[PDB]
Amino acid sequence: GMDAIKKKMQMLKLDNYHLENEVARLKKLVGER
């Protein structure tokens, strides 16, 4: 139902958050702030 749409949207936002946290790790390892 609409609950599957809510879950997949909130899951894609969590995957996006994990990828932003991995980009933030790798930027910091390159000697950034």
């Binding site: 139902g1 609409m2 599957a4 749409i5 809510k6 936002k13 996006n16 958050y17 932003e20």
Partner: protein, 40 residues
């Protein structure tokens, strides 16, 4: 702590998924749940 502005929040916390779907018709909600197959 400044980190609370993002720790536990994605790049897209600008609308709640309850309110995002709120105005759709019953045949739109069916055809939007069908899109989840194409998205995966």
């Amino acid at each position: 702590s400044t980190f609370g502005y993002r720790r536990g929040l994605s790049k897209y916390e600008s609308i709640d998924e309850d309110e995002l779907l709120a105005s759709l018709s019953a045949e739109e909600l069916k055809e939007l749940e069908r899109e989840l197959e194409d998205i995966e």
